[PDB]
Amino acid sequence: TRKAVIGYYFIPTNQINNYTETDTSVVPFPVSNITPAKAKQLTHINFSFLDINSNLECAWDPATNDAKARDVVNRLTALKAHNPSLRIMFSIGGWYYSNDLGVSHANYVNAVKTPASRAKFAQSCVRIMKDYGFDGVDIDWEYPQAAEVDGFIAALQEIRTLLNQQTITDGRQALPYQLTIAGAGGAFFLSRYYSKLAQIVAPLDYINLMTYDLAGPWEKVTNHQAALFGDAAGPTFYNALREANLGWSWEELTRAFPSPFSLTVDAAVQQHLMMEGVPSAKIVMGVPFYGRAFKGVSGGNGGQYSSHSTPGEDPYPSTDYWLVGCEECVRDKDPRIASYRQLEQMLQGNYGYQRLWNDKTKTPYLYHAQNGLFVTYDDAESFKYKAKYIKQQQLGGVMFWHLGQDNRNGDLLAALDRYFNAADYDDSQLDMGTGLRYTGVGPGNLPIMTAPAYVPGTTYAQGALVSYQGYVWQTKWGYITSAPGSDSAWLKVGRV
Amino acid sequence: TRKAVIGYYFIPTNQINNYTETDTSVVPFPVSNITPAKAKQLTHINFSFLDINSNLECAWDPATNDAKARDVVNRLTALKAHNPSLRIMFSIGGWYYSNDLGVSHANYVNAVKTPASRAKFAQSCVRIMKDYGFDGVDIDWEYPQAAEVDGFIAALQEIRTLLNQQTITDGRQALPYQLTIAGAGGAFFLSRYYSKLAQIVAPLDYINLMTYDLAGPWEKVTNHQAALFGDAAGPTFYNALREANLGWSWEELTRAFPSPFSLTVDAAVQQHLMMEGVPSAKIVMGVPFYGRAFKGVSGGNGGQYSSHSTPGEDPYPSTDYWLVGCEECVRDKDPRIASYRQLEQMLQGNYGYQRLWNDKTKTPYLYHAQNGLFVTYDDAESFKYKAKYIKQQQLGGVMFWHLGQDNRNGDLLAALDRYFNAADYDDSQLDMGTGLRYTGVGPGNLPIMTAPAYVPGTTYAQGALVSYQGYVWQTKWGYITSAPGSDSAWLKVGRVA
Numbered sequence A: 001t002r003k004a005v006i007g008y009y010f011i012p013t014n015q016i017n018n019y020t021e022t023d024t025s026v027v028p029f030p031v032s033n034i035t036p037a038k039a040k041q042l043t044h045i046n047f048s049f050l051d052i053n054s055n056l057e058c059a060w061d062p063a064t065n066d067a068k069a070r071d072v073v074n075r076l077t078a079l080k081a082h083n084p085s086l087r088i089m090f091s092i093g094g095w096y097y098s099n100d101l102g103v104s105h106a107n108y109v110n111a112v113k114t115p116a117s118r119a120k121f122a123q124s125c126v127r128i129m130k131d132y133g134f135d136g137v138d139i140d141w142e143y144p145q146a147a148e149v150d151g152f153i154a155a156l157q158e159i160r161t162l163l164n165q166q167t168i169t170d171g172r173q174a175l176p177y178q179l180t181i182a183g184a185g186g187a188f189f190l191s192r193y194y195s196k197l198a199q200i201v202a203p204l205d206y207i208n209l210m211t212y213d214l215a216g217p218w219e220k221v222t223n224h225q226a227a228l229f230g231d232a233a234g235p236t237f238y239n240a241l242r243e244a245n246l247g248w249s250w251e252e253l254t255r256a257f258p259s260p261f262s263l264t265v266d267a268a269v270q271q272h273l274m275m276e277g278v279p280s281a282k283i284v285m286g287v288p289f290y291g292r293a294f295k296g297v298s299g300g301n302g303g304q305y306s307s308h309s310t311p312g313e314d315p316y317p318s319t320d321y322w323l324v325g326c327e328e329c330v331r332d333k334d335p336r337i338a339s340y341r342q343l344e345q346m347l348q349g350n351y352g353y354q355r356l357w358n359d360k361t362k363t364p365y366l367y368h369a370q371n372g373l374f375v376t377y378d379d380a381e382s383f384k385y386k387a388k389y390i391k392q393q394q395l396g397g398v399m400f401w402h403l404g405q406d407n408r409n410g411d412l413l414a415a416l417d418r419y420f421n422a423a424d425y426d427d428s429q430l431d432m433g434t435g436l437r438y439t440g441v442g443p444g445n446l447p448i449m450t451a452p453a454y455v456p457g458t459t460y461a462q463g464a465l466v467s468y469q470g471y472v473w474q475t476k477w478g479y480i481t482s483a484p485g486s487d488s489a490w491l492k493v494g495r496v
Numbered sequence B: 001t002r003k004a005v006i007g008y009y010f011i012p013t014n015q016i017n018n019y020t021e022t023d024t025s026v027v028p029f030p031v032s033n034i035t036p037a038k039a040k041q042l043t044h045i046n047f048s049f050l051d052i053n054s055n056l057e058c059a060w061d062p063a064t065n066d067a068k069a070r071d072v073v074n075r076l077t078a079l080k081a082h083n084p085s086l087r088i089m090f091s092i093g094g095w096y097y098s099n100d101l102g103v104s105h106a107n108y109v110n111a112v113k114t115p116a117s118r119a120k121f122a123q124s125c126v127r128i129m130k131d132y133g134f135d136g137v138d139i140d141w142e143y144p145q146a147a148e149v150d151g152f153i154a155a156l157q158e159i160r161t162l163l164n165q166q167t168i169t170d171g172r173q174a175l176p177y178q179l180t181i182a183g184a185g186g187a188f189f190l191s192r193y194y195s196k197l198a199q200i201v202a203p204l205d206y207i208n209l210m211t212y213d214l215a216g217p218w219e220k221v222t223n224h225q226a227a228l229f230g231d232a233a234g235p236t237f238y239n240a241l242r243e244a245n246l247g248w249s250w251e252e253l254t255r256a257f258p259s260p261f262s263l264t265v266d267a268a269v270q271q272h273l274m275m276e277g278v279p280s281a282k283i284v285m286g287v288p289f290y291g292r293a294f295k296g297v298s299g300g301n302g303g304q305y306s307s308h309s310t311p312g313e314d315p316y317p318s319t320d321y322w323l324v325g326c327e328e329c330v331r332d333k334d335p336r337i338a339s340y341r342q343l344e345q346m347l348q349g350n351y352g353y354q355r356l357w358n359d360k361t362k363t364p365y366l367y368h369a370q371n372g373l374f375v376t377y378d379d380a381e382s383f384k385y386k387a388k389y390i391k392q393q394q395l396g397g398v399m400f401w402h403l404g405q406d407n408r409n410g411d412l413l414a415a416l417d418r419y420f421n422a423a424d425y426d427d428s429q430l431d432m433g434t435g436l437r438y439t440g441v442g443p444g445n446l447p448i449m450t451a452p453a454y455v456p457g458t459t460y461a462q463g464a465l466v467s468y469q470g471y472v473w474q475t476k477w478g479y480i481t482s483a484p485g486s487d488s489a490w491l492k493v494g495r496v497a
Ligand SMILES: Cc1cccn2c(=O)c3cc(C(=O)NCc4cccnc4)c(N)[n+](C[C@H]4CCCO4)c3nc12
Pocket: A094, A095, A096, A140, A142, A182, A213, A216, A217, A218, A312, A313, A314, A315, A401, B479
């Protein structure tokens, strides 16, 4: 099974309305920059972002020039001439539209409320897909809360039904229409819907975990934003999942959700695999094509794990563009984010940066000794370890934000495709290091065990192991005369 | 409101069929030993035990001579001439009949299964009560499991309906027929039904907690079997309630059920009070009229919290009767249980025992220095603190097992009545000590708190407190943009006035 390679294509409305493929000053990353070689290295392009309007329907930004928008999408779907497996998805949501404090948040809550609203919203998704020529629907609601999850589920189920019927109607058995979501990659947002992961993922082809932004100006201690494994010297976090409305016992919560823990990519993946009904092949690991920069950091450890003075507000509440050498930061008016393309040029232009490597997290980072700056980012080296992880854990593939942040040669995308598909690349001896692994155990990743069959009428001592109804159970205290599952005394510890 | 004083009267079928009041070798504790003075000190006598037969009806042991049974019960109900508040209850169950491996266990599970079976069983309970002259029904099922609790509750409700109708029919408004159960006194058995305590206790007049046997030879470390409060120097136990099917979060389970914890009487009472809908006035504290003995006790502990070499297997797997001076242990053939009557007779007959006192647990214990023996028991002094606890916590009263283990003068029963009712007893200055209290917090004992009202649209930092929909909530982490109760981020920590 070929690994998915899902690249976001993001274009703001102003750039759509003024679209041109011959002037990077207006449109920095036109569709023409996606060469045939790059199209062949992708399996999915997530066009972004559409929204949910006050009519509770999928819709473009109301300021969008529809004729210019159709032309942009047509240029993307023309790329399928170079890659018969390529799908041009469209994404609904993103942080700006759909976060709790976002401009359109209430429309997401209201669209999934009722059977009538869900049917109307689901129909509009398929309509938009067919009217503009997209190959599937991606929903990036960041993020539905506990009371909204069941409606969110039924809406996804409704879209799945309509997409499957549309696949048959259009003869698309060879390339069926698909449904994906961007899912939270950290435990705090994940706890909103974690208990219902199985019913969320059931109608999806993939859940694309946003396993980045695990550090940012909203945290007082600098850190890697997409550490693969944990560094004991770095900060640790409250494991919010132990508070999810799971109904598990104290022992089950404790063994599944050690706290505090290292907020890493491996943690997010393992937390998903701990849940019953979440298959590894549907889990896609997100990676960032951008870095996050911090100022006012101290010395002694390359700027890692230090206090900082980076503004947290949105948008950037100043004109102080303090990321030395970041020309894109001036154009975008924000020194806290830098594309890999810009970071590469900052490393090549003598601005005082050093590129350092953390062999526990398996991620690079920049340090500016003279102005106290720290940048966490990913590159082709960190992608070696993440690609091997994807293969070892039998995940569905990789996702990234976004195509316009790769360098001009497309080195990041080419690296991902190479690590998955190149016949002359061999990572069998790649050293995954001694960084901290997430060691939680849950119902979905219980180890295989053997035990004598449970015998009704037997009195079991503390620590006894029995097999019953497909699982191996252990007594939590002594003098146990009840059957596993009928009591508080038995802990499910294994399967088969 | 007078505190309940509930004494079990237990008599085996063998003793009923051969009942006599002039031969202690056949019947050691005849009803005649319950003098008018003792009858006035009781509010309830739990006659025990009846059973549930394979027809799923309340019934006497099939080997019971029915005429002899009626005669024994009549001697108990005649005691009401001396005490117009006294009730002769009858108890269905007990350990032998109703434990998971007991001879009649399946009858208890099956009787509560369906509306028809519950109706048939409930009718048989009231029929037995009226036929033999009892004043109420007590059910000692030890213990219903999670899947059986809902049927068990519906059966209790059905008995409640029939008892209330029988009260009206018999003009017994001045002394209505009552319904009680014996409940678990330790967290392990309690976890079976803990989540449904409110609906279990609703149809009852009392739930009589079996707050004894909290220690015994089956434990590797000697301990008090009915410690009122905890001793930090003593052993601690897994808090099984954190594994009950409550649906609470990790923070809520941890805050309600500290673990490990001291297995005490106070723990069991407070664990019941942590649940909403469980009124203190229905909780009755059980006390033992017997002791538990250990050997091999090695230490300067006074024998407390020490390793031991006591069998604690049943039945006693030896003939070594090493409890020096326990003659009842020889006749009964078990050196690990002794009535208070015998323990007193061991103390006054020169056997080398020292009576020591633990001022944390507020319980006495025996220690035999030359042979290293340890006995945990209760007496009139430990009952002072338990009686004051009952009054301070506004509990319903006290229960004890059993009447035949008191001394001949009835000193234990007289002490309980004195501490509740005597005008010349004054425990106002009795110091309850510094033993460990159970400090768990649950929905039934959330404190009143004050906090600013939650404001929609606000982003809250970690540890922020807000009031919302009748509760005070605290954030467990930062950058909170959700409303309390809609999220995993908010912890219920208090109630709004
Ligand atoms: C406050 C905050 C707290 C915790 C997490 N947070 C984010 O995880 C986050 C992500 C994003 C984001 O867009 N990631 C890329 C992306 C790509 C594709 C789809 N979805 C998202 C974001 N813009 N912000 C707000 C920034 C903007 C300036 C300062 O705060 C975010 N804030 C927070």
